Each structure stands twice: as C-alpha cells, then as structure tokens.
Amino acid sequence: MNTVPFTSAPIEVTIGIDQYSFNVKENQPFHGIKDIPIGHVHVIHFQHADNSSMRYGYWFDCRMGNFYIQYDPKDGLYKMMEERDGAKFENIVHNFKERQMMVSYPKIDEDDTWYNLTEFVQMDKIRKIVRKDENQFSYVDSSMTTVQENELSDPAHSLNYTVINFKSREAIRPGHEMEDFLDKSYYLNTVMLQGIFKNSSNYFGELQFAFLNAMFFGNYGSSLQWHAMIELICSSATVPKHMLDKLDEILYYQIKTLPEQYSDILLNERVWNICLYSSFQKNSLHNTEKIMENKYPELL
Amino acid sequence: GAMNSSNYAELFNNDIKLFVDDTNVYRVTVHKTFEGNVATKAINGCIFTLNPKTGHLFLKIIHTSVWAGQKRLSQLAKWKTAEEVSALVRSLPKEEQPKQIIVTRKAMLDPLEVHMLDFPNIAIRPTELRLPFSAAMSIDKLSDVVMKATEPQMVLFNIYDDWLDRISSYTAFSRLTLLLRALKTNEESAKMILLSDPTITIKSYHLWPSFTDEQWITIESQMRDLILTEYGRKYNV
Ligand SMILES: COc1cccc(CC(=O)O)c1
C-alpha cells in the first residue's frame, strides 16, 4: 500500500482520490493520502473552494515512482512532483504517518468499483494521450481540448485521443460507401482494432480513460470521445463476442458510478437511445440497458 | 447552411451549383396478389439534377434492373442517387464541377456527403424551399424517355428551352417552378392550359410550347389561377 504525501494545504480545497473526495480547510494540518492500492492507476484531483472553475488533477501509478503534492503560490495550484531520494521520501511519509496527518484511501473490501472502471487503463497509454514526457504522472483539467476539437489551440496541452470520425475517408472504403456508413465493422475491426489500437484491451483502455476524464473534470472533449467509442462498437454488425460482453460490463459500472445529478450533461441522449434501441447491438448490452432504464429512464 | 427565401438570389450567381431531387428515383405501383396480399412492382425512375442558372438538366434514368435482388429499396435509392451524382461530378471537367450541391430532401445529405468525401470543397446543402421538382415526370418528353429506357442512361436537356435568350435565370426559374407547381397540383388542368391552343406547338428540340412573351404572361396568369383555385377546392375557401 503506497502514499501520496502533501507539504501543506495552504488553500481550502476539495480533494478527490479516484471516486472518493474530502474537504480540506485553509491551512488545515493535512499531509497526505495513505493506503493507496497497488496495482491500479489512480487520479488525485482538486477543486478549489474559492474558484470551482477548473477541476484539475494527476493520473499516476505508485509503482513508477515516489510522488508528493505541494501547493505552488505562483501558479496557484496543487502540483504533483517526483522525489528521486527514496530514503528521504520514506522518512517524510513515516513522520506524517506517526503524527496521523494523512487520510486513508477508504476502500471497502467487497468493493471492486475502481478496478472495474480502470480494468484496461494503463499508465503508459495515458502518457501517450497526455504528452509531457519529463514526468511519470499526467496532468488533466476541465478545459483541455482534444486533438480532434483543435482540428474543428495549443498542441502541448491537448488530449491526443484517437480521432474517430464516421464521415471521413478513413471510415469509408471507396466503393463501399453505403455499406461502411450503415455498418461500421470495417472501421472498428480493421482500421481501429487491427490497425491503430492493435487489440481490444487498448481500445477499452482509452474508452475508460475518456469516461473518467469526463466524469472527474467535466472535460467535454473526453465525453465526446467516450460516446464516439461506444457508438463505433454499437454501430458495427460484426463485433467479437468477448468484446460485447466486456463492453456491457464496462458501461454498467460507468453508469453505476456516474453522479445522478450530472447525468444531464455527461450522457448524450442520441447516442444512448441509438445504441440501446436501434443499433446492431441493441440486444447485446443487457446489464447496461437494465441499469440505464432504472436509473435514467428520462433520457430514454 | 440551408437554402431559403432569404438567400434566394444566390441560385443565379456565377458559382456553379446543382439541385438534386431524388423523389422519382424509386417508383412503384402497388397491387394485389392472387392470394390477396399486396406487392409492389417497380417502374423506371430518374434523378433530377438541375443547374438553376443555365437550365442544364442531367436526367439520370434509373432502370428497374438496379433494384433486382436488393432489400430496403427506399434506403438504397438515396445511396444510389448519391453514387450517380458523385459519378456525374467526377465525369465533369474541373472547371464545370459544382461548388455547391443543394438536395431537395434532407435525407439525401448524409448519403451525398459520404459519396463526395473526395470533394471536400463542394458544399452539400439542404433547402427550406418546397420545390416542385417531383412533377418533372409530368413533362411529357421527360416521362417518355424514362419509361422507354431499357438500360441505365443519362439524357441531357435544357429545362428552360430558349427562354434565357429573352429573360434572366431568376425569371426562368420562377416560370419553371410555377409550371411545375401547377402540374403537381392539377396535372390535367395544367396540361390543358399549356396545349389548348393548337397553333402554339412544342419544337422538336424543346420541352414546352413556343409562347410569345405576351402569351407567357397569359399562360403564367392561368397557372396562378389554377393553383389558387385548387387551394380553394382543397381547403374550401
Ligand atoms: C511531502 O512529501 C514529500 C516527499 C518527498 C519530498 C518532499 C519535498 C521536500 O523535500 O520537502 C515532500
């Protein structure tokens, strides 16, 4: 079990760690998050009390280094950093743990929610979507735009999700216009799965990361990416059976976790009605259809 | 964006544009079977592709054989239309290719957009105008070439005959849409108006009678009356 220690908390802030959150008051003696489960990526995220504008945060994996958080009064935010001196870092964390200045990652033993939301998410792929190679962790916030959004403005600060566009030459084989537009199996299986992602695990990883950035930061371009990746599968008549069963589980846990009060802005009515009730896969997402119908029957 | 009454003169500027109407592509007769069920029999159709500035009409005849063994024909008809319009554009020299294609029905937008991906600079636009191009098969010479076709065929016409020698393309289009609206609202009456006077004939190389300017004013008035009438007979006013 690993720790993300904090120098101090000089400004009042709501701190998120994965699906959990807690309020820290201005100058409260708060020195970290301990008992973080090894084996998963994690996200530590922030919303300042005085400017709820800009949720921001950091994706990280404690197996890759010793990370600490410290408030920068010039840039006005909590920054993740890496300490290369391991003994020094162990000594700092041990001191905070003895003075009981940390909150404990509050995982219930029965609870597989975080695993289920991050099953295919790998830090190495996060770092290719979020390019900042000098750090082992990745910063994301509410305003960052995607490569596709920028085509339709700073490249270094963009989310390099895989571009999906149903009315594009990449999606439509010359001579199969009607076929490929009405059944996207070519685009899913040859262009995207075989060609770009290489396997369905990497596809699901990007889909899961896009959902999590939409939910935790209200990142609009990530929400677009999540829905596009769902729609591409549901609009394909030919999908491997293991992928459909896994997609149903993925979406089930995403819909289960979504704040009930954000459903209006994080769920696209057109995509979900099309996917559950009109698409080729309308009968292939039993778990997802059942939770959607019981939790958000208004959207449908 | 969409084409409507506000940007109407744009049709007659010097940017090449085509209207595409697909309402006569897939045509059927509905009939009873010996068992008392209902079935359809396709008949030949046509794509109506029109340059409103020049009157040039590219009439692609759709022979019933293109439907043989196909399912979901009303959906296929939109994609077939888009395939044929795309092939027509590619067949034209670059300086004759349109800068815009206006579709009369919004369901043609995605099929045409997908078929024209190779032409990113050609704008595909809908329209808010309710244009009467479905009545093109009430023009006798157009109906005749469609029904006589035994194979796919493209036939070129000028739907304005020689009117542009005497009038502008705005006025020619207005005359065409009035004639077609009348033929659409009461075909029998409209055709009676156009031909009642046997001394006015249709030239072999024309679609409409050889009216003088004064006779066109009379004809045009008779068509407006017909349309307003029918609007009464219909609504009782
Ligand atoms: C607050 O946790 C840590 C851990 C390692 C280094 C630091 C920064 C320091 O040396 O003060 C902080």
In a 3-state reduction of DSSP, which class is residue B129? Answer: coil
In angstroms, the Cα distances linking B166 to B8, B161, B162, B211 are 21, 11, 8, 12
Sheet order of strands, B100-103 included = B123-125, B100-103, B17-21, B45-50, B56-62, B153-158
Contact B174, B220 (CB under 8 A): no
Residue count of chain A: 300
Residue A253 neighbours by CB under 8 Å, 6+ apart: A113, A116, A117
Name the pairing type of β-strands A103-104 and A32-36: parallel
Cα–Cα distance, A118 to A121 (Å, whole number): 5
Bridge partners of residue A146, in order along the sequence: A159
Dihedral sign of CA atoms A242, A244, A250, A256 in order: negative
Minimal Cα–Cα distance from B86 to chain A, Å?
11
The edge-to-edge listing of strands for the beta sheet with A13-17 is A20-24, A13-17, A42-48, A56-60, A138-141
- What backbone phi and psi angles, to 5 degrees, belong to A111? -95, 115
| Local structure of B99: helix, strand or coil | coil
Q: Which residues of A30-42 are buried (b: 16+ CB within 10 A; e: fewer)?
A: bbbbbebeeebbb
Instruction: Determine the distance separating the centroid of ligand 1 and the alpha carbon of B160, expressed in angstroms.
Output: 84
CB distance A89 to ligand 1 below 6 Å: yes
Residues B20 and B81 sit within 8 Å (Cβ to Cβ):
yes
Q: What count of Cα atoms within 13 Å lies in the side-chain half-sphere of residue A252?
A: 17
* β-bridge pairing A77-82 and B56-62: unpaired
Distance between B114 CA and the closest CA of chain A, angstroms? 6
B118 to chain A: closest CA residue: A169
Q: Is the dihedral of CA A44, A48, A52, A56 positive or negative?
A: negative
Contacts with A167 from chain B: Cβ below 8 Å: 110, 113-114, 117
**Domains observed in chain B:** 9-163 (3.30.420.230), 164-237 (1.20.80.40)
Q: Taking CA atoms, what residue in A is nearest to B109?
A: A167
Q: Is the CB of A92 under 6 A from ligand 1?
A: yes
**CA of A170: which chain B residue's CA is closest?**
B117
Dist CA A89 CA A73 (whole Å): 23
Identify the closest residue of chain A to B78 by CA–CA distance: A178
* Calpha distance B82→A175 (Å, rounded): 12
Q: Which helix (H) or strand (E) holds B193?
A: helix B187-195
Residues with Cβ within 8 Å of residue A145, at least 6 apart in sequence: A153, A158, A159, A221
Site to substitute for ligand 1 among A68, A81, A101, most atoms within 8 A of C-beta: A68
DSSP 8-state class, residue A195: I
Report phi then psi at B180, rounded to 5. -70, -40
DSSP A47-72: EESS--S--EEEEE-GGG--EEEEEE
Ligand 1: which of A34, A89, A101, A102 to mutate, judged by most atoms within 8 Å of the beta carbon? A89
Neighbour count for residue A174 (Cβ, 10 Å): 10
CA angle B58–B64–B68, rounded 5-degree value: 130
In whole angstroms, give the CA distance from residue A131 to residue B83. Answer: 42
Are the C-beta atoms of residues B26 and B77 closer than 8 Å to each other? yes
Compute the C-alpha angle A141/A143/A144, nearest 5°: 75
Q: Does the CB atom of residue A5 touch ligand 1 within 6 A?
A: yes
Output the CA angle B128-B131-B132, nearest 5 degrees. Answer: 155
Specify the DSSP element, H or E, that contains B166: none
**Measured in angstroms, how far is the CA atom of residue A21 from the centroid of ligand 1?**
23
Cβ contacts of residue A208 below 8 Å, gap of 6+? A117, A118, A119, A120, A121, A250, A254
Rounded CA separation B3/B10 (Å): 9
The answer to whether the Cβ–Cβ distance between A167 and B117 falls below 8 Å is yes
| Experimental technique behind these coordinates | X-ray
Residue A178 contacts B, CB cutoff 8 Å: yes
A6 touches ligand 1 (CB under 6 Å): yes
Interface list for chain B against chain A, based on CB atoms closer than 8 Å: 76, 79, 82-83, 110-111, 113-115, 117-118
Structure token digits, residue B150: 């035994």
Which of helix, strand or coil describes residue A210? helix
Tokens read off for B142: 């157009």
Best residue among A83, A88, A93 to mutate for probing ligand 1, ranked by most atoms within 8 Å of CB: A83
